[PDB]
CSV table of C-alpha atoms in Angstrom, one decimal:
chain,number,residue,atom,x,y,z
Y,1,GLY,CA,-15.8,-9.5,-6.6
Y,2,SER,CA,-13.4,-12.0,-5.0
Y,3,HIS,CA,-9.8,-11.2,-3.9
Y,4,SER,CA,-6.8,-13.2,-2.9
Y,5,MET,CA,-3.5,-12.7,-1.1
Y,6,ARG,CA,-0.5,-15.0,-1.9
Y,7,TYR,CA,3.2,-15.5,-0.8
Y,8,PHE,CA,5.6,-17.4,-3.0
Y,9,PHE,CA,9.0,-18.6,-1.8
Y,10,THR,CA,11.8,-20.2,-3.9
Y,11,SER,CA,15.1,-21.5,-2.5
Y,12,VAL,CA,17.8,-23.0,-4.8
Y,13,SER,CA,21.0,-24.7,-3.4
Y,14,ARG,CA,24.3,-23.5,-4.8
Y,15,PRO,CA,26.7,-26.4,-3.9
Y,16,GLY,CA,30.1,-24.8,-3.6
Y,17,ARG,CA,28.8,-21.5,-4.9
Y,18,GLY,CA,27.7,-20.5,-1.3
Y,19,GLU,CA,24.6,-20.4,0.7
Y,20,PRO,CA,21.2,-21.1,-1.1
Y,21,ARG,CA,19.4,-18.5,-3.1
Y,22,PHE,CA,16.1,-17.5,-1.5
Y,23,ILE,CA,13.5,-15.2,-3.1
Y,24,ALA,CA,10.1,-14.3,-1.5
Y,25,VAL,CA,7.3,-12.2,-3.2
Y,26,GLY,CA,3.7,-11.3,-2.1
Y,27,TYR,CA,0.7,-10.5,-4.3
Y,28,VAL,CA,-2.8,-9.2,-3.8
Y,29,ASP,CA,-4.8,-10.4,-6.8
Y,30,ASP,CA,-2.5,-9.7,-9.8
Y,31,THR,CA,-0.5,-6.9,-8.1
Y,32,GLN,CA,2.9,-7.7,-6.5
Y,33,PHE,CA,3.4,-5.7,-3.3
Y,34,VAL,CA,6.5,-7.0,-1.4
Y,35,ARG,CA,9.8,-8.9,-2.1
Y,36,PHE,CA,12.9,-10.2,-0.4
Y,37,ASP,CA,15.9,-11.4,-2.3
Y,38,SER,CA,18.7,-13.1,-0.4
Y,39,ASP,CA,21.4,-11.9,-2.8
Y,40,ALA,CA,20.2,-8.3,-2.6
Y,41,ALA,CA,22.2,-5.7,-0.5
Y,42,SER,CA,19.4,-4.5,1.9
Y,43,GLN,CA,18.5,-7.8,3.5
Y,44,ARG,CA,15.0,-6.4,4.1
Y,45,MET,CA,11.5,-7.0,2.9
Y,46,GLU,CA,10.9,-4.2,0.3
Y,47,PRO,CA,7.7,-2.5,-1.1
Y,48,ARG,CA,6.7,-3.2,-4.7
Y,49,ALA,CA,3.4,-1.3,-4.8
Y,50,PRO,CA,2.8,2.4,-4.0
Y,51,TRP,CA,0.0,1.6,-1.6
Y,52,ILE,CA,2.2,-0.5,0.8
Y,53,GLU,CA,5.1,2.1,0.8
Y,54,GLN,CA,3.4,4.0,3.6
Y,55,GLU,CA,3.2,1.1,6.1
Y,56,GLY,CA,5.2,1.9,9.2
Y,57,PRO,CA,8.7,0.7,10.5
Y,58,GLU,CA,6.9,-1.9,12.7
Y,59,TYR,CA,5.5,-3.5,9.5
Y,60,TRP,CA,8.8,-3.5,7.6
Y,61,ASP,CA,11.0,-4.7,10.6
Y,62,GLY,CA,8.5,-7.4,11.5
Y,63,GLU,CA,8.1,-8.7,8.0
Y,64,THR,CA,11.9,-8.6,7.4
Y,65,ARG,CA,12.3,-10.7,10.6
Y,66,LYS,CA,9.7,-13.3,9.6
Y,67,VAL,CA,10.8,-13.5,5.9
Y,68,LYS,CA,14.4,-14.2,7.1
Y,69,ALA,CA,13.1,-16.9,9.4
Y,70,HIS,CA,11.4,-18.4,6.3
Y,71,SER,CA,14.7,-18.2,4.5
Y,72,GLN,CA,16.5,-20.2,7.2
Y,73,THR,CA,13.8,-23.0,7.6
Y,74,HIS,CA,14.1,-23.5,3.8
Y,75,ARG,CA,17.9,-23.8,4.0
Y,76,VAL,CA,17.5,-26.5,6.6
Y,77,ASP,CA,14.8,-28.0,4.4
Y,78,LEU,CA,17.2,-28.3,1.5
Y,79,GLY,CA,19.5,-30.6,3.6
Y,80,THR,CA,16.5,-32.6,5.0
Y,81,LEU,CA,15.1,-33.4,1.6
Y,82,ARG,CA,18.6,-34.2,0.2
Y,83,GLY,CA,18.7,-36.7,3.1
Y,84,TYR,CA,15.1,-38.1,2.4
Y,85,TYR,CA,16.0,-38.7,-1.2
Y,86,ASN,CA,19.6,-39.8,-0.5
Y,87,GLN,CA,21.0,-37.4,-3.0
Y,88,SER,CA,24.4,-35.9,-3.6
Y,89,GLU,CA,25.8,-32.8,-2.1
Y,90,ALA,CA,27.0,-31.8,-5.6
Y,91,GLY,CA,23.8,-30.8,-7.2
Y,92,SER,CA,21.5,-27.8,-7.1
Y,93,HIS,CA,17.9,-28.5,-5.9
Y,94,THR,CA,14.8,-26.2,-5.7
Y,95,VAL,CA,12.2,-26.0,-2.9
Y,96,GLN,CA,9.1,-23.8,-3.5
Y,97,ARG,CA,6.4,-22.9,-1.0
Y,98,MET,CA,3.1,-21.0,-1.5
Y,99,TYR,CA,0.5,-20.1,1.0
Y,100,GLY,CA,-2.3,-17.5,1.2
Y,101,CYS,CA,-6.1,-17.1,1.1
Y,102,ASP,CA,-9.1,-16.1,-0.9
Y,103,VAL,CA,-12.1,-14.1,0.2
Y,104,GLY,CA,-15.4,-14.0,-1.8
Y,105,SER,CA,-17.4,-11.1,-3.1
Y,106,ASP,CA,-18.7,-10.5,0.5
Y,107,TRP,CA,-15.0,-10.4,1.5
Y,108,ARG,CA,-15.4,-13.3,3.9
Y,109,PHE,CA,-12.9,-16.2,4.1
Y,110,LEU,CA,-13.3,-18.7,1.3
Y,111,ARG,CA,-10.1,-20.8,0.7
Y,112,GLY,CA,-6.7,-21.1,2.4
Y,113,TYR,CA,-3.5,-22.7,1.0
Y,114,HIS,CA,-0.2,-24.1,2.2
Y,115,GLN,CA,2.0,-26.2,-0.1
Y,116,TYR,CA,5.5,-27.2,-1.1
Y,117,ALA,CA,7.2,-28.6,-4.2
Y,118,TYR,CA,10.7,-30.2,-4.4
Y,119,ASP,CA,12.5,-29.9,-7.7
Y,120,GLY,CA,9.4,-28.7,-9.5
Y,121,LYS,CA,7.0,-31.4,-8.4
Y,122,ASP,CA,4.4,-31.5,-5.6
Y,123,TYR,CA,5.8,-32.5,-2.3
Y,124,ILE,CA,3.1,-31.9,0.4
Y,125,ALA,CA,-0.1,-29.8,0.5
Y,126,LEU,CA,-2.6,-28.7,3.1
Y,127,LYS,CA,-6.0,-29.9,2.0
Y,128,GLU,CA,-9.2,-27.6,1.7
Y,129,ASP,CA,-10.5,-28.8,5.1
Y,130,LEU,CA,-7.3,-27.3,6.6
Y,131,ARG,CA,-7.1,-30.3,8.9
Y,132,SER,CA,-5.4,-32.9,6.6
Y,133,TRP,CA,-2.4,-33.3,4.3
Y,134,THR,CA,-1.7,-34.7,0.9
Y,135,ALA,CA,1.7,-36.3,0.6
Y,136,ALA,CA,2.4,-38.3,-2.6
Y,137,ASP,CA,5.9,-39.6,-2.1
Y,138,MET,CA,7.2,-42.1,0.4
Y,139,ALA,CA,9.8,-39.4,1.5
Y,140,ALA,CA,7.0,-36.9,1.9
Y,141,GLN,CA,5.5,-39.3,4.5
Y,142,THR,CA,8.1,-38.4,7.1
Y,143,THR,CA,7.0,-34.8,6.7
Y,144,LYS,CA,3.3,-35.7,6.8
Y,145,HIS,CA,3.6,-37.7,10.0
Y,146,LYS,CA,5.8,-35.1,11.6
Y,147,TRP,CA,3.4,-32.3,11.0
Y,148,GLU,CA,0.5,-34.5,12.2
Y,149,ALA,CA,2.3,-35.2,15.5
Y,150,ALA,CA,3.3,-31.6,15.9
Y,151,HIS,CA,-0.2,-30.2,15.0
Y,152,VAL,CA,1.1,-27.9,12.2
Y,153,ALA,CA,-2.2,-27.7,10.5
Y,154,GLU,CA,-3.9,-26.2,13.6
Y,155,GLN,CA,-1.5,-23.3,13.5
Y,156,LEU,CA,-2.0,-22.9,9.8
Y,157,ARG,CA,-5.8,-23.0,9.9
Y,158,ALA,CA,-5.7,-20.3,12.6
Y,159,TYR,CA,-3.6,-18.0,10.4
Y,160,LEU,CA,-5.5,-18.6,7.1
Y,161,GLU,CA,-8.9,-18.1,8.7
Y,162,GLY,CA,-7.8,-15.1,10.8
Y,163,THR,CA,-4.7,-13.0,10.0
Y,164,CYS,CA,-4.6,-13.7,6.3
Y,165,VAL,CA,-8.1,-12.5,5.5
Y,166,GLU,CA,-7.8,-9.6,8.0
Y,167,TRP,CA,-4.7,-8.2,6.3
Y,168,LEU,CA,-6.0,-8.9,2.8
Y,169,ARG,CA,-8.9,-6.6,3.4
Y,170,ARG,CA,-6.6,-4.1,5.1
Y,171,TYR,CA,-4.6,-4.1,1.9
Y,172,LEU,CA,-7.8,-3.8,-0.2
Y,173,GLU,CA,-9.1,-0.6,1.5
Y,174,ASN,CA,-5.5,0.9,1.8
Y,175,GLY,CA,-4.8,0.2,-1.8
Y,176,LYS,CA,-8.4,0.7,-3.2
Y,177,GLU,CA,-7.4,2.9,-6.2
Y,178,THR,CA,-5.1,0.2,-7.5
Y,179,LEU,CA,-6.7,-3.0,-6.1
Y,180,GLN,CA,-10.4,-2.1,-6.5
Y,181,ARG,CA,-9.7,-0.7,-10.0
Y,182,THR,CA,-10.5,-2.4,-13.3
Y,183,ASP,CA,-8.8,-1.2,-16.5
Y,184,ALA,CA,-10.7,-2.2,-19.6
Y,185,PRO,CA,-8.9,-3.5,-22.7
Y,186,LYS,CA,-8.1,-1.1,-25.5
Y,187,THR,CA,-8.8,-3.2,-28.6
Y,188,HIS,CA,-7.9,-3.2,-32.3
Y,189,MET,CA,-7.2,-5.5,-35.3
Y,190,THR,CA,-4.4,-5.8,-37.8
Y,191,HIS,CA,-4.5,-7.5,-41.2
Y,192,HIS,CA,-1.3,-9.0,-42.8
Y,193,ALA,CA,-0.9,-10.5,-46.2
Y,194,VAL,CA,0.2,-14.1,-45.8
Y,195,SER,CA,-0.2,-14.8,-49.6
Y,196,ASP,CA,-2.3,-14.1,-52.6
Y,197,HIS,CA,-5.2,-16.0,-51.0
Y,198,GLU,CA,-4.8,-15.7,-47.2
Y,199,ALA,CA,-4.3,-13.1,-44.6
Y,200,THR,CA,-3.9,-13.1,-40.8
Y,201,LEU,CA,-6.4,-11.2,-38.7
Y,202,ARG,CA,-5.1,-10.5,-35.2
Y,203,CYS,CA,-7.3,-9.1,-32.5
Y,204,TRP,CA,-5.5,-7.2,-29.8
Y,205,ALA,CA,-6.4,-6.5,-26.1
Y,206,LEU,CA,-4.0,-4.0,-24.4
Y,207,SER,CA,-3.7,-2.0,-21.1
Y,208,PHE,CA,-6.2,-4.1,-19.1
Y,209,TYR,CA,-6.3,-5.0,-15.4
Y,210,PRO,CA,-7.0,-7.5,-13.8
Y,211,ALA,CA,-5.2,-10.2,-15.9
Y,212,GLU,CA,-8.2,-12.5,-16.4
Y,213,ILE,CA,-9.7,-12.0,-20.0
Y,214,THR,CA,-11.4,-14.2,-22.6
Y,215,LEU,CA,-10.4,-13.4,-26.2
Y,216,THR,CA,-11.9,-15.5,-29.0
Y,217,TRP,CA,-12.6,-15.5,-32.8
Y,218,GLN,CA,-15.7,-16.8,-34.5
Y,219,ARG,CA,-16.5,-17.5,-38.2
Y,220,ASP,CA,-20.3,-17.0,-38.7
Y,221,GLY,CA,-20.9,-17.2,-34.9
Y,222,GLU,CA,-19.3,-20.6,-34.4
Y,223,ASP,CA,-16.3,-22.0,-32.6
Y,224,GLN,CA,-12.9,-21.4,-34.0
Y,225,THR,CA,-10.8,-22.7,-31.0
Y,226,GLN,CA,-8.6,-25.2,-32.9
Y,227,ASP,CA,-8.1,-22.6,-35.6
Y,228,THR,CA,-7.0,-19.6,-33.4
Y,229,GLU,CA,-3.4,-18.8,-32.4
Y,230,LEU,CA,-3.8,-17.3,-28.8
Y,231,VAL,CA,-0.8,-16.1,-26.8
Y,232,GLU,CA,-0.3,-16.3,-23.1
Y,233,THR,CA,-1.5,-13.2,-21.2
Y,234,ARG,CA,1.7,-11.2,-20.7
Y,235,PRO,CA,2.6,-8.2,-18.5
Y,236,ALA,CA,3.2,-4.9,-20.2
Y,237,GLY,CA,5.5,-3.9,-17.3
Y,238,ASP,CA,3.4,-1.0,-16.0
Y,239,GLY,CA,0.9,-3.1,-14.1
Y,240,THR,CA,-1.5,-3.9,-17.0
Y,241,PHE,CA,-1.6,-6.9,-19.3
Y,242,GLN,CA,-1.8,-7.7,-23.0
Y,243,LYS,CA,-3.1,-10.6,-25.1
Y,244,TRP,CA,-3.8,-11.3,-28.8
Y,245,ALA,CA,-5.7,-13.9,-30.8
Y,246,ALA,CA,-5.1,-14.5,-34.5
Y,247,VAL,CA,-6.9,-16.4,-37.3
Y,248,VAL,CA,-5.8,-16.9,-41.0
Y,249,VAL,CA,-8.7,-15.8,-43.1
Y,250,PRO,CA,-9.3,-16.8,-46.8
Y,251,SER,CA,-9.2,-13.7,-49.0
Y,252,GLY,CA,-12.6,-12.1,-49.3
Y,253,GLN,CA,-13.8,-13.7,-46.1
Y,254,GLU,CA,-12.9,-11.0,-43.5
Y,255,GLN,CA,-16.6,-10.2,-43.0
Y,256,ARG,CA,-17.4,-13.7,-41.7
Y,257,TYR,CA,-15.1,-13.3,-38.6
Y,258,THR,CA,-15.7,-11.7,-35.3
Y,259,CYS,CA,-13.4,-11.2,-32.4
Y,260,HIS,CA,-15.0,-11.4,-28.9
Y,261,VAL,CA,-13.5,-9.8,-25.7
Y,262,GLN,CA,-14.8,-10.4,-22.2
Y,263,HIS,CA,-13.2,-8.6,-19.3
Y,264,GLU,CA,-14.9,-7.3,-16.0
Y,265,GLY,CA,-13.7,-3.8,-17.0
Y,266,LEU,CA,-16.1,-3.9,-20.0
Y,267,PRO,CA,-19.8,-2.6,-19.5
Y,268,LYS,CA,-20.6,-5.3,-22.0
Y,269,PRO,CA,-18.5,-7.8,-24.0
Y,270,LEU,CA,-17.1,-6.6,-27.3
Y,271,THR,CA,-17.8,-8.1,-30.8
Y,272,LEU,CA,-15.4,-6.7,-33.3
Y,273,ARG,CA,-15.4,-7.1,-37.2
Y,274,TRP,CA,-12.9,-6.1,-39.9
Y,275,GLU,CA,-14.9,-3.8,-42.2
V,1,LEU,CA,1.3,-10.1,6.4
V,2,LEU,CA,3.4,-13.3,6.7
V,3,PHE,CA,2.8,-16.4,8.8
V,4,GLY,CA,4.9,-16.3,12.0
V,5,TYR,CA,5.7,-19.8,13.0
V,6,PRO,CA,8.6,-22.0,11.7
V,7,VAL,CA,7.6,-25.1,9.8
V,8,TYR,CA,10.3,-27.6,8.8
V,9,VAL,CA,9.9,-30.6,6.4
S,1,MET,CA,14.6,-34.1,-12.5
S,2,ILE,CA,12.1,-31.8,-14.2
S,3,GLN,CA,13.2,-29.4,-16.9
S,4,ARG,CA,10.6,-27.3,-18.8
S,5,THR,CA,11.4,-24.9,-21.7
S,6,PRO,CA,10.9,-21.1,-21.5
S,7,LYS,CA,8.1,-19.6,-23.7
S,8,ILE,CA,9.4,-16.2,-25.0
S,9,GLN,CA,7.6,-13.1,-26.1
S,10,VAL,CA,9.4,-9.8,-27.1
S,11,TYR,CA,7.1,-6.7,-27.5
S,12,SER,CA,6.9,-3.1,-26.5
S,13,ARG,CA,4.8,-1.6,-23.7
S,14,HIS,CA,3.0,0.9,-26.0
S,15,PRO,CA,2.3,0.6,-29.8
S,16,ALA,CA,5.6,1.5,-31.5
S,17,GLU,CA,5.7,5.0,-33.0
S,18,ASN,CA,9.1,6.0,-34.4
S,19,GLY,CA,10.7,8.8,-32.5
S,20,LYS,CA,8.7,8.2,-29.4
S,21,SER,CA,10.0,6.6,-26.1
S,22,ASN,CA,8.8,3.2,-25.0
S,23,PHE,CA,10.0,0.0,-23.3
S,24,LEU,CA,11.0,-3.2,-25.0
S,25,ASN,CA,10.0,-6.2,-23.1
S,26,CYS,CA,11.0,-9.9,-23.2
S,27,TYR,CA,8.7,-12.1,-21.1
S,28,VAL,CA,9.9,-15.7,-20.3
S,29,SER,CA,7.6,-18.1,-18.7
S,30,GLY,CA,6.8,-21.8,-17.9
S,31,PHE,CA,10.4,-22.9,-17.3
S,32,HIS,CA,12.1,-25.1,-14.7
S,33,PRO,CA,14.8,-24.9,-13.2
S,34,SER,CA,15.0,-21.2,-12.5
S,35,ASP,CA,18.5,-20.4,-13.9
S,36,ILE,CA,18.0,-18.8,-17.3
S,37,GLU,CA,20.0,-16.2,-19.2
S,38,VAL,CA,18.0,-13.5,-21.0
S,39,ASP,CA,19.4,-10.7,-23.2
S,40,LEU,CA,17.9,-8.0,-25.3
S,41,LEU,CA,19.7,-7.0,-28.5
S,42,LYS,CA,19.8,-3.8,-30.6
S,43,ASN,CA,21.0,-4.5,-34.2
S,44,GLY,CA,22.8,-7.6,-32.9
S,45,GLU,CA,24.7,-6.0,-30.1
S,46,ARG,CA,23.7,-6.6,-26.5
S,47,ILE,CA,21.9,-3.8,-24.6
S,48,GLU,CA,23.6,-3.1,-21.3
S,49,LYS,CA,20.9,-1.7,-18.9
S,50,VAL,CA,18.2,-4.4,-18.9
S,51,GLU,CA,16.1,-5.0,-15.7
S,52,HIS,CA,13.9,-7.8,-14.7
S,53,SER,CA,11.1,-8.6,-12.3
S,54,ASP,CA,11.5,-10.7,-9.1
S,55,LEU,CA,11.3,-14.4,-9.6
S,56,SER,CA,7.9,-15.8,-9.2
S,57,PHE,CA,6.1,-18.9,-10.4
S,58,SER,CA,2.7,-20.1,-11.6
S,59,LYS,CA,0.3,-22.6,-10.1
S,60,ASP,CA,2.0,-25.5,-11.7
S,61,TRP,CA,5.3,-24.3,-10.0
S,62,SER,CA,6.9,-23.2,-13.3
S,63,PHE,CA,8.8,-19.9,-13.2
S,64,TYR,CA,8.2,-16.5,-15.1
S,65,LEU,CA,10.3,-13.3,-15.5
S,66,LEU,CA,9.8,-10.0,-17.4
S,67,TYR,CA,13.0,-8.4,-18.7
S,68,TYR,CA,12.7,-4.8,-20.0
S,69,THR,CA,14.6,-1.7,-21.2
S,70,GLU,CA,13.6,1.9,-22.2
S,71,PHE,CA,14.0,2.5,-26.0
S,72,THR,CA,12.8,4.8,-28.8
S,73,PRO,CA,12.0,2.9,-32.1
S,74,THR,CA,13.2,4.1,-35.5
S,75,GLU,CA,12.3,2.8,-39.0
S,76,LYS,CA,15.8,1.2,-39.3
S,77,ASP,CA,16.8,-0.3,-36.0
S,78,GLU,CA,16.2,-4.0,-35.4
S,79,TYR,CA,15.6,-5.5,-31.9
S,80,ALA,CA,15.5,-9.1,-30.4
S,81,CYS,CA,15.7,-11.3,-27.3
S,82,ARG,CA,18.3,-14.1,-26.8
S,83,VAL,CA,17.6,-16.8,-24.0
S,84,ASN,CA,19.7,-19.6,-22.7
S,85,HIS,CA,18.4,-22.4,-20.4
S,86,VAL,CA,19.3,-26.1,-19.8
S,87,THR,CA,16.5,-27.1,-22.1
S,88,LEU,CA,17.9,-25.2,-25.1
S,89,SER,CA,20.8,-26.7,-27.1
S,90,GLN,CA,21.8,-23.2,-28.2
S,91,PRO,CA,20.7,-19.6,-27.5
S,92,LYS,CA,17.2,-19.1,-28.8
S,93,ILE,CA,16.8,-15.6,-30.5
S,94,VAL,CA,13.3,-14.1,-31.1
S,95,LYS,CA,13.2,-10.9,-33.2
S,96,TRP,CA,10.8,-8.1,-32.2
S,97,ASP,CA,8.1,-7.8,-34.8
S,98,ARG,CA,6.0,-4.6,-34.2
S,99,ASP,CA,2.9,-6.6,-35.0
S,100,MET,CA,3.1,-9.4,-32.3
């Protein structure tokens, strides 16, 4: 089906405690594949996925060069924004930037992204047309006008429609065993005595990839959304994800409840019952 | 592969 | 300035079987700013070799991190996570329940 490529960048100022902290990571779908951390010893872009570890020295030296350039525009950015907001030199501030692309099931270009946030709120974003900008703040307008005059969007559209999509599907065929895989959830239920008249039924989905999944409970085939405790899909640490959904069942009513699991790794969706 | 042109706010 | 509290989950990579090697995880998510302190504890004491993922964030710009250590569960040892962030008036401790 569809695929995406994304780069996330975070810079945090450390007033007095040295130069700003910069962290960069890249993902293809739910799999991280590269990182750069400013405080790390190597000062190089590093592999984080087995399939990218065999790219050449040209790749690694070129990406190290470009990621460090990104580090430095962000450290100028920290000053610029402190200026736009007439803020003190004493406080720590965060700039975040994300850009990347999506391809459809035919693997053709579908969406492109380029956006910034300052201290955790939207600052400026390239719109879907990849010809205009959304700036909310009055300070953000300097940036909007600047980038308009300088034709920033034209450079960005060019990359997002060309290079981004091109290397995404290079990564897709070069990492096909990982990226074109699908691990189906291993499911089970647990039953715990809450009291003399109630018990929790928890439905588990473990070891699945990709992270998207729908896990729901029903009582006689109807909605139980307000009545289900559902946790956030979490990483197991080995590249798969986990999730659970729980309902408190009145004693003697276990047979009324069903757990439903939808995941693209399943040949058909599961309906599970405690019995 | 990263974008290669500097952008400054 | 925005400050969002960390959600915390402490769990193992594989279903816990006593006497068998595993990884204890503490996933912290949805927080802002990114400075956070996360420890994993074995019977109250602090475990020394704990690693974490590289800082990333969600679509809403809030941050997430996975902290993890190798461990072999027993019937008697207790484990937990202790997190500190600007949003928490004191270190929040979440105990590892094998069933969550």
